[PDB]
Amino acid sequence: TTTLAFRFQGGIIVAVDSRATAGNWVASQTVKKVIEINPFLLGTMAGGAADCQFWETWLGSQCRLHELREKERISVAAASKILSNLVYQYKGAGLSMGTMICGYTRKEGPTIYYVDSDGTRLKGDIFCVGSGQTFAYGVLDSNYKWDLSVEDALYLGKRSILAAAHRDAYSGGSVNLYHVTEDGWIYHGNHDVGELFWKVKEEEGSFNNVIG
Amino acid sequence: TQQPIVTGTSVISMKYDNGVIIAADNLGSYGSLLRFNGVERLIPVGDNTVVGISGDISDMQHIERLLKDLVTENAYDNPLADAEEALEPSYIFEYLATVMYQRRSKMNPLWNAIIVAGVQSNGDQFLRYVNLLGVTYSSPTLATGFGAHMANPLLRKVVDRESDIPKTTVQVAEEAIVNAMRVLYYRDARSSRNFSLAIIDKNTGLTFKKNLQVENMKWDFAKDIKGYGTQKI
Amino acid sequence: TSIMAVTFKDGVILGADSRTTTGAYIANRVTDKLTRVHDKIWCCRSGSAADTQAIADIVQYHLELYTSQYGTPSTETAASVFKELCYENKDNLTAGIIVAGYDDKNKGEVYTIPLGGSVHKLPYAIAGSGSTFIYGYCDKNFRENMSKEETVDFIKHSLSQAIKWDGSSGGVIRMVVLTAAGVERLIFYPDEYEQL
Amino acid sequence: TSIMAVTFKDGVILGADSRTTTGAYIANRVTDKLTRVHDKIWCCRSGSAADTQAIADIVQYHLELYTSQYGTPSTETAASVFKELCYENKDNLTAGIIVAGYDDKNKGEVYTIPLGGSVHKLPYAIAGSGSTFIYGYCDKNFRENMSKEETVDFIKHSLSQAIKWDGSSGGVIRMVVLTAAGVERLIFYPDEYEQL
Amino acid sequence: MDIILGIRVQDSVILASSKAVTRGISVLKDSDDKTRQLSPHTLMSFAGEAGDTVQFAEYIQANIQLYSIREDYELSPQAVSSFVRQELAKSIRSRRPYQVNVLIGGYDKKKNKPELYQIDYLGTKVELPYGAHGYSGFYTFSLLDHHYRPDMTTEEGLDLLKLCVQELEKRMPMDFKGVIVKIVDKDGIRQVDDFQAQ
Amino acid sequence: SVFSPDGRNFQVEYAVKAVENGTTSIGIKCNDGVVFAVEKLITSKLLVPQKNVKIQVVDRHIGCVYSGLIPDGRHLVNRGREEAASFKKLYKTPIPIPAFADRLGQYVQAHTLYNSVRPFGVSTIFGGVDKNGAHLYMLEPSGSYWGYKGAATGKGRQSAKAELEKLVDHHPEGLSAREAVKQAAKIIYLAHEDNKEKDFELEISWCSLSETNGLHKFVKGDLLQEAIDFAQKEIN
Amino acid sequence: QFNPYGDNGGTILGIAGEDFAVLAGDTRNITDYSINSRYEPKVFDCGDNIVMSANGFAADGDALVKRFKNSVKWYHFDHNDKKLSINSAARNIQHLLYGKRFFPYYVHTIIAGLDEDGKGAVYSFDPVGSYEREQCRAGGAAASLIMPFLDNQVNFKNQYEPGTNGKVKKPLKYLSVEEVIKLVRDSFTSATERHIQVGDGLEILIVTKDGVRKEFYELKRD
Amino acid sequence: TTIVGVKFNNGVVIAADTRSTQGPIVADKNCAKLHRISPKIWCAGAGTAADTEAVTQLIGSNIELHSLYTSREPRVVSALQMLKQHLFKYQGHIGAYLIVAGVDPTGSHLFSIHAHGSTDVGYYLSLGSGSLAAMAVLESHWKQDLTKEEAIKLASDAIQAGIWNDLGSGSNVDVCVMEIGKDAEYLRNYLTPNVREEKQKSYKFPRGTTAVLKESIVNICD
Amino acid sequence: SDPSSINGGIVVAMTGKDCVAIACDLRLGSQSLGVSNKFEKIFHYGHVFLGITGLATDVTTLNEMFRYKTNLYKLKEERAIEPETFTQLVSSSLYERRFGPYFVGPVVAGINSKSGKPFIAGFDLIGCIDEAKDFIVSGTASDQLFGMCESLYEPNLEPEDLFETISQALLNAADRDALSGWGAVVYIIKKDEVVKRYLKMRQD
């Protein structure tokens, strides 16, 4: 798995891969590792497929409940802290998850929290999570400017996932792209690595390590 | 979490045109010590069901108690207890299957493998297996332990698939079973010469035979065998 | 495995069951456990089959050589060769051997070589997993200077009890009679000895 | 430990040796392994001394409560109480118990409860580490309906063989006689039984 | 090992804490605050096992704030540190102990003394002129044994820490990404938010 | 949990009234067993005949019949059954009848001890064959029970008791199971005299050493008709 | 020590069509190197037009199917006989599995039916509740032998239009039920040749708006 | 530790050595191992010293309450039963090994109790590391119908065998004699055959030898 | 990593003529790392003194527990707890945690305010009482302390002499142990007055 989220001039970019494995068995190439929590909140999933899917689907239930109780969208801080507090109750029982809670609110502006099953909760501008994280960081960190145009940031995220899909055996499938503004998230499509690699190679002139 | 102590070996069975046969030897082993020789591991329930049990004997005896009072309970406020609301083989099995699987799920198994042989009131033959893990399956023939490895191949030569069942007569089937019991006595170090056999027939009902012996054994060829390779005398 | 050797008036008899098992599976119901290492020196093997066959093969080799050079070896000499092999390699051997033989001077003799590789000279000896069940019976029924037919009876009875209780024992009872007359192979089938 | 119980013509006799060991040290050479749980229901204990004493104390209690409410219990009932305790607590017990009682309706009876907690009704039964050495002997020598003196001899002989071969057994031989006539204690000393 | 340092000068207490958060083969963050304000004159710094660290700090914070609001009064550093100690000493024998080490730096207004308390996850409490948790202590204790004076000013204390950090950058195996520094005096708690390139 | 000033328990006393108000039921001991019988009021033509069984078995060897609140009776039998199971589990043998009697005794009696429980509104007639004979018992709402040669409870208890008294006096030698079945049919017919505004169905059960091998069984078909016939005969 | 788990072999396959779905499995049940049964079905009709298989440890598989059938029964009771949609069943199965996250059902479970629009649907779950809707899926002992074939023949992966040089992928099409049954039977003859735990018989369940139809085929008994 | 018990014709005696250890180090050169359960029921322990102590006091406490409740002298078989049931409940984790001995209205009693909860009765017993050195003396010299003087001599000799020959045992011999007639007599340091010899030199320091940094008076009261 | 070793420390107490002494080191370490120079290990609850070695968290906890209990004792009994009785309170308090003990070796020192006689005692971690009247030792240098004491000690020492003996015993034992030292305090105790001296020792 490779998942990333970064903050910038024009909001937040969130990009993830779509591969599930069991040992060396490639289990699926079409898995959805981003959860749409409400029109202003996203969660990303890395680690155990069930752990992530279950508890983040649950997180959506708890966020909806906050809307009804307080007549108001939950803050990213508090949404992340529900997940983080739950996961902490379970510490030691062997849950395995690393996630990012991303979204906009009027009070916070665009916000990203990294939450993992150790109980770690961090606010920050740039996160990559999963077995492929280091491959992502390398591309992302060396091209990241705060001033990126929406178009260029979208590409950077996409390209960083491509990077990790290529080098990480446990990453691949496709890229799912999201952009998060004041108006909420916008989905920027699914991109098969099968097709994307060749297109990017030819157009960017990179991946010269690769034959043909 | 436990370990079997006093044990019983294979239980074997098959179904013929009118019913089901089941057999089991009369031994209770204690590791390699052939300790107790008068042990009944076929348990009749009513007169349409026999429950054959292998594995731990203490647990076998607990399952006995469970079945006896399952018959008692069924008679309570039940004017049809000896008729339409009699216990069925399928009921008795589903009960045992439930218990087995709950016990493994509590990490405290009944250390057994069980075959439930009987005839349903509509006439259908019933033959089904459940064991310490709560795994269940049905087949024209079934056998536990060494029976699984040696008896099944022999009995399947008589009944290979479902359609072979109308073709199989009680005589043929009892012959196959009595022969497989001899083979098991030849090769199973935890087996005994004495056994019990039960037939549940849709016409004859339950015939229960005790104190059968493995007869007509081949040993004479033994005398000619000397040494382990080169030795001549 | 149930194995024994008994000295009597005229010589010595060796007896054994014929069962070999890997786990609860009977690999062989008709094994010959009575093994000749010289005309009138035989042994009974228990423990690892590989180990005891390899040992028996080496002893037979040493006694064939002994005989070419120095004549007929005593039963004591046979026993010593076994001990030597068993003691010196005690770290990679599971071998329990009973040595029995007849010559004209020392008459009938029995030696037992258990797991350590020690040697023990005895009027009779039992061994194998099944032997444990007959310690009391044997001690109670053995006499010195028994006739041939009496001894065949003692071994037959003892080994039937051992076969009855030990699951590793079973099959037929084999025997070998060793006297001045020569060498006699005996066999007894389950239908005879169970009825005792 | 060597323990046995034998049904006969007039009732049942319980016998045992008197040795308790920790490792190779004889902690007690004059132990009493014959345990009263009711007037004419006794048992023999093998396995963990703690577990068997705790168990016999609870059964004694259960049978005393039984008597007060329902009259004298049958030997079967006594065996059932042992089984309940031994089976239901098998993960934490190392208890091998032989139950033997005299009764006016059912005469002499013997029940054996080995490690699992299973129950077996038998003509006679043997247990304890020392019992392995007398399986053959006992199976060859036991007959039904023996006279009192014959059963005393059968137990005396059997146990002396068990004592002779088991290091964990030894000391004196204790017996408890259970018939209509009452309850009799017999003791036998090394000088007596070693001769046999 | 994260770096948690505390130095008690004449009129204040200074805490320096490493900014790095590292899981595995990645530095995830280079600007972490390993500190919770407990009351206007009491500050706690923490290091240890991943999740336990913040959950504990924030539970301690909640309890102290509650007490303040209930009594309209601020507990002394001596009192807060005893609360924390007892909490850890309870935790050490529970089903799953908190694996957190702490420094508590406070200014006692009744006494007008600054105070530094070192407490490990076992609940071992001690008051010290300077303290540290983890490997970092193996370098700083001796350094400070030499350079520290009981009557130093706050500006002098900050030069003492600069030595400590520079030493830790020369000799520690891992990049702890510099330290956040905070001062607790009579005027409360403030951050020297310019320690890195200075 | 309240004694009245005369030493009686007024709540138990009112329970008795509820029993006296019920259908009449009986038990007769014979020389190798017990027979039980009950009056089933035919409320309506719509009741399915033979289908509203009042008599209940406990274990395999014990019969139970009662008068009063039928639900109270069923509760008691359920408990009797657990008390039977629990006994067999521990002691192997099936529960002796005196022992089973005290089990119901103590339980019924317990419901007279506390102010938050009401006593049972039934008297129960029960019994069977155990290892040393046949036993008949009747248990009142107080938990009082004794052994009986013959027993009756319900609306027609007095007329039934008088008939029983006659048999005891005229059969010191003992009655037979076969016979007691007919006699029970007679007695229920005689007892129906004090409840005759409704038609009734007869129900009989027995536990005889030689007629049932000491197990509880219902009286159906041939034998039930012979009993009805015999009772119809000595009323015309 | 007692091991609460076992492995009874077998192999299951789900394919979704435009307006149908199939869920197939072999009928063989095994332990180590023994055959327990040549005909023990493990694909079941669960009512509401849903078929379900839970392959792996058969004790766990049976418990799960039992529990889902019951879940359907109570859904009807609690919710005025409403039809349980395939997505709703799926989500419910997630919860069943996850309830045992710390003592899991060792099964790969697959379900098939039709979505609200009448389209063929296949969902598959890992042993602890993770799930996804797919076009096709193999489970069990021989999944690794079959999944690549399905990727190739069902989703046309690595296939290109001849002469486009490798620039234009073969367009993805829906398969007819005849075409799908051909694939299932071939997948299973392949799997039987090469996996020792696969054989004896093939039982296919087909789900359309007309209900649930059942077909059976002999497989190699060795 | 060596502890013994010896029954004589009119009662019972217990003796023990007075060395307690911490691994190879002697902690207390004259500890009292002989405990009182009640005035005429005395106890000797080995194994975990805190366990034998605590278990003795708990049961002594309960025995007193029992005695008051029943208006009877405590019985030894009651100490026995209470001890063995408590120990058993704890499955050996209370490492108490005891020789219990006393007189009561039914006579004189001698038992041993092991940490797991097993009891034995005997005429003479021993426990602790010196157990075997003491038993050797007892098996050599015990005879039936010993007098009071003889039983003290025998018990004392057996403790001595432990003192000299067992490294876990040393120093002095404590005895307690319980006769059916009178009160129990506790003979503390009945033998003192291990007096430390006079030191070769005094190690009294000239005052001012130790260097002091500071000095203050400490306040007790308020 | 064995809890009785993580922090280090020693306590010793001795009886003299109409007096008692209790002394301890001041080191608090974390294995090899010396951490604190001022960690005293002797506490008093009235005229009754308690020294505690072992896991320093348990040392603190026990002090806070015996302060609690002796405060409540004083309020109900209307007098201060005595040495003999405190000993028993210590013993039964420790045994109460029999299967999760405090990792400590406590030492009690004080004079009976009524009988006037000197009293010392020690305990293992589960409250077994060591009832020596001569001396009691505890901590990571116990072996060394045992040798110093048995050699140096003699009965009926005067307060001023007893000071010297107990000081020499402690100092020389401390210096043959890696985990003890770093300072020392000696309490000399009489029925009327208590002097506390800090000792000058090797700081390595």
Ligand SMILES: Cc1ccc(CNC(=O)[C@H](CCc2ccccc2)NC(=O)[C@H](Cc2nc(C(C)(C)C)no2)NC(=O)c2cc(C)on2)cc1
């Ligand atoms: C929605 C979604 C899907 C996929 C992902 C990425 N993770 C994954 O792909 C992880 C990687 C392995 C892992 C890492 C850390 C902890 C546990 C397991 N894989 C996973 O969780 C697999 C999924 C799977 N398993 C299977 C079979 C049926 C076992 C062949 N087919 O798919 N289940 C497991 O590893 C698993 C094993 C057990 C037991 O329970 N779940 C994230 C989020």
Ligand SMILES: [Mg+2]
């Ligand atoms: Mg055999």
Ligand SMILES: [Mg+2]
């Ligand atoms: Mg140093």
